[PDB]
């Protein structure tokens, strides 16, 4: 039960290239400094992993292959071992999060590499005796209420059913009424994810207008039928593995952003949720050292749905996208301090 | 102005509220005909917190009554202080709960909760600014557990921003006036901790012991017991009605006394309390009251705090007194008895003072405490529950009314997780 | 021609105001109805001085202040009390709901819906003023109103007005004594924002005045009325040169000019040395020497902070009554001869002096005695860093378990505004250290 926290600094965009915006964050190997332009002082942050993607020729540059091969493939092999995995993702609008997990049509992220390497290893490991079968799911959390995204809504005030979570004693928590759909190639995943992210809830306070106001979990349950009892050869014990990949929303200060009504609730819940997650992550990094603590999964929905993917003999990974400009100096600080507390 | 809506369910809630109003009216100068016959003018400045106005200087309380057998509402009507209530708020039905949490939550409670919310919306929309709700119900039973928790679930959706307390009468270890106490209490805790802000766990063993040892009474009936719960209820909302040197309200206490949201079950207490004979030999001062408050033979929780640690404590005083005495005494408590207070909260205490004491006393005090020892009050039920649930003793009266076994294991695991949460801060 | 607008936030603010304005009404002869018999007796004078009290054509005098609490229980004692005919009925009784001892609720959620009225009334008051110099705010750390609404109001005022003094008499939390678990968080979040706006932020501590009462005045069971009167005496000693005629006048542009070396270290301490009763009012000479020696005496300070654990950067001494500068020169030389009182190596002067002729007034139903002379001292030290560190340790104990945070983020706050304030307050503690270092060649 070890959780790894990482960071990836994005390189300058064309706009902030032209405006000659100032660089505030620098790298010394595994330490990352943030320097207020020259104002008074600088803060220094340390993480288990650090990806300096600011310009191409720096040593320690982090191509997408490096991000996958360092963060994800351990999740793959630990899943084939038979255990479960949870990958997180945090970053405010304009940090390089969509480029990271999904990517572009010529610059892959984490998800396509994950699925493609998965099906390749399956189809080469598939035998006359062994077999495999995968099933997906994709849902969201909005104001501590669950919603499924694979459904094609009609026309209504809202075709968003607030499903309820339950606690089966053996398997643990689950969602009542969750659409689970089979998969054997990655295109079948794209066909669902495009629809889902089209059905994801988004809103505009005054900033970038298409900003997510909800959490989104993409889960894959994978089965191993390796086991054939030679006494009669009809099926026996069987392994199952859960792989959760969750895209979160931003902290969002509610004062600088003079918000009202539904734009406040949407933000309050997200703040609460992230805090709960923080405590969990912290406690697990305090749990590996060998102490006695309590992991409060029940103070949030996202944690209660994922009690079994984090705790126990499972793996967890967190990556935090940050922008190096000077305009976005408060947001980056928030992100880095969040991930630091996730480290300790 | 702030405004409380007082819901009350079951025999316990009816019989507690009928005394609570009997006291608030005395404090504010109201008579059982609704009329005002007081002396002081501060009794009317903030009468909008509990009462509403009417034509001939009448004052009708904002009380809602949600039983399911008329046998008790008739006793309130056919009583001393029954006429002041609004007859359109005496909600009731028939086909009683049979002391079953199922009937009061799914079958014979869903058929009536709408008629209750119809009154709640009337009495809430008619307010300048509501602060929150209140409730008085008994776990272990039926109606008060089921319909109460259902109304909580339905009020927390409409009014999430506002406050929702519950003066809950928890079961007792030794005595048991009902045989299905555990199964109902567990399912009520499963629906309270997610949907409450500050509840006050009460146990009748503690009140019998208070009535026997301290007040030195030989024939304590439930009227003499609820006479204490009324006092606590009144003390919580004193600084919301009367002035003070350092005022307070419900939200202040809920902020100071709830470090984490799942931990809002409090042990209450009231001081002074003396036998009629022994009132000539006691000095009415702050330290005597503090001694009586932090003693374990006055808390209503039926739970020894010395077996745990005080996460947070609140003291609401009433009378012309000093602000040095309170601070000094509370610091002395934090320092001497440090083993009963956490260390990652340096000051585990707070204070409120009102300048207006009760009708017959020169000083009064009220005590609220969040203590880890409360796990004993649930660790017991989880023994009674599972022993009965290991082989499904009285369960066919619950399934047959539209339930399933998973709904029991849910509540069991939640209650146990709460135990483990309060144990984290014990050693 | 010499005006100062007072602002009162919270229970602490309003009660300090009910003391201060009683005092000011007594000094100037104003009755609680706002009238004056003296000006109709002889026909002259400006005893009801235009620094604090306005005037209209009916010989009435209204104060230049405004109250606000976000809770109606307090102001409704003023509206329904002995001083009801004095205040303009525009007192903010916005008693929908209180802050619940939460900075987040007195900054964004409930802190709006009031603030615009406050700004309107302050403009209405300033437009009635000619030569305004000051905005004396009285608030209290620990509370939600005094922590949040004060910060927001000062944010707005540093834009609307700008090159105007904005002082602050706050109730700083005690090291042991306190009336809430959430005192630290609110304090550390207030000092982070009320450091770039304010110009001089005085500070007191109720533990110190409690110690003063049972050792100077001989009161073993005091109450807040016995403390806010001393605070009113402080403010009167501060705001007397604008009212009464004296030798060495000292306005508000001089306190901020001779006690703030650098713009971040403007947190001084106060003392009012004669706190004796009418019995001990006799048996004692009460000369300038005794008093000035009492100001630098621990156990007579108003913040629990031993200055011998630090150094003095500057100190202003404002005297009242029968005083001659010869005695002040003597006493300053005496204090500079001593060795327990360390002054920095970059301030040999280290002394501003102010003298006035009007002695203090005696409030009936009071505790203090009549005296022919009185004194206030305001002193900047490097020692008050100790209290900041004490509070920061409590912060760092609770914020690690992430206790009491969900009540804040449930009211419009993220988790980063905390760590932005503990790292902003962990630099001022370093500044007060750097200033304490003797220079080197
Ligand atoms: C002169 C004197 O002190 O006599 C007391 C008295 O003997 C004592 C014992 C009173 C008495 O209380 C009881 O008799 C009692 C009996 C059973 C269970 C609980 C109490 C008293 O009735 C209580 C009564 O005080 C009050 O009534 C309070 O205002 C109380 N009033 C009511 O509850 C009330 C009930 C029904 C109708 C109208 C008012 C109250 C307490 C808290 C908040 C609001 C009101 C007074 C002076 C006394 C007597 C009369 C003996 C005490 O009452 C309280 C709650 O403080 C019980 O111990 C205290 C201390 C008093 O000394
Ligand atoms: N010296 C002095 N301190 C006071 C007085 N009243 C309150 N305080 C202090 O102020 C602290 C908290 O402030 P509050 O009394 O809650 O007033 P507030 O700032 O408006 O807080 P809220 O009412 O909740 O918004 C208390 O802990 C007291 O220590 C007073 O009259 N005199
Ligand atoms: N304190 C108090 N407890 C009561 C009273 N009447 C019943 N009880 C308790 O309530 C429990 C049974 O609850 P019940 O009255 O059946 O609630 P209901 O199911 O809603 O009617 C028992 O454990 C009793 O001890 C009362 O008047 N006062
Ligand atoms: N490692 C990288 N190399 C080059 N460009 C990047 C990298 N990471 C992010 N970017 C740029 O940053 C932008 C991120 O925009 P967007 O996808 O809206 O971020 P987010 O998904 O966090 O809102 C992309 O246009 C992309 O070109
Ligand atoms: Mg207040």
Author numbering:
A (entry chain K): 392 to 735
B (entry chain B): 1 to 427
C (entry chain A): 1 to 441
What did the publication describing this PDB structure actually write?
KIF14 is a microtubule-based motor protein with essential roles during cell division. KIF14 belongs to the kinesin-3 family of motor proteins. As all kinesins, KIF14 possesses a highly conserved catalytic motor or head domain that contains nucleotide and microtubule binding sites, and where ATP hydrolysis is coupled to the generation of mechanical work. Here we report the near-atomic resolution structures of twenty KIF14-microtubule complexes corresponding to five distinct KIF14 constructs in four nucleotide conditions mimicking four key steps of the ATP hydrolysis cycle.
Construct K748 includes 13 neck-linker residues and no part of the CC1 domain. All the KIF14 microtubule-bound structures in the ADP or Apo states are very similar with the motor domain adjusting to the open conformation. Comparing the microtubule-bound and microtubule-unbound structures of KIF14 in the same ADP-bound nucleotide state also reveals a displacement between the tubulin interacting regions. KIF14 helix-6 (KH6) moves relative to helix-4 (KH4), and KIF14 loops 8 and 12 (KL8, KL12). The displacement between these areas causes a movement between other regions of the KIF14 motor domain that to a first approximation can be described as a relative rotation between two subdomains within the KIF14 head, a plus-subdomain that includes regions that interact with the microtubule toward the plus end, and a minus subdomain that includes regions that interact with the microtubule toward the minus end. From the KIF14 microtubule-unbound to the microtubule-bound structure, the distance between the switch loops and the P-loop increases and there is a large displacement in the position of KH0 relative to the microtubule and the switch loops. These structural rearrangements disrupt interactions between the ADP phosphate groups, the switch regions, and the P-loop providing an explanation for the acceleration of product release associated with kinesin microtubule binding. We also propose that the open nucleotide conformation and the large displacement of KH0 relative to the plus subdomain facilitates the incorporation of ATP into the nucleotide-binding pocket and the exchange of ADP for ATP. In the ADP structures, the density at the tip of SW1 is relatively weak indicating higher mobility in this area compared to the tip of SW2. Densities connecting the side chains of the highly conserved Arg in SW1 and Glu in SW2 (KIF14 R604 and E643), indicative of the formation of a salt bridge between these residues, are resolved in the kinesin-microtubule complexes.
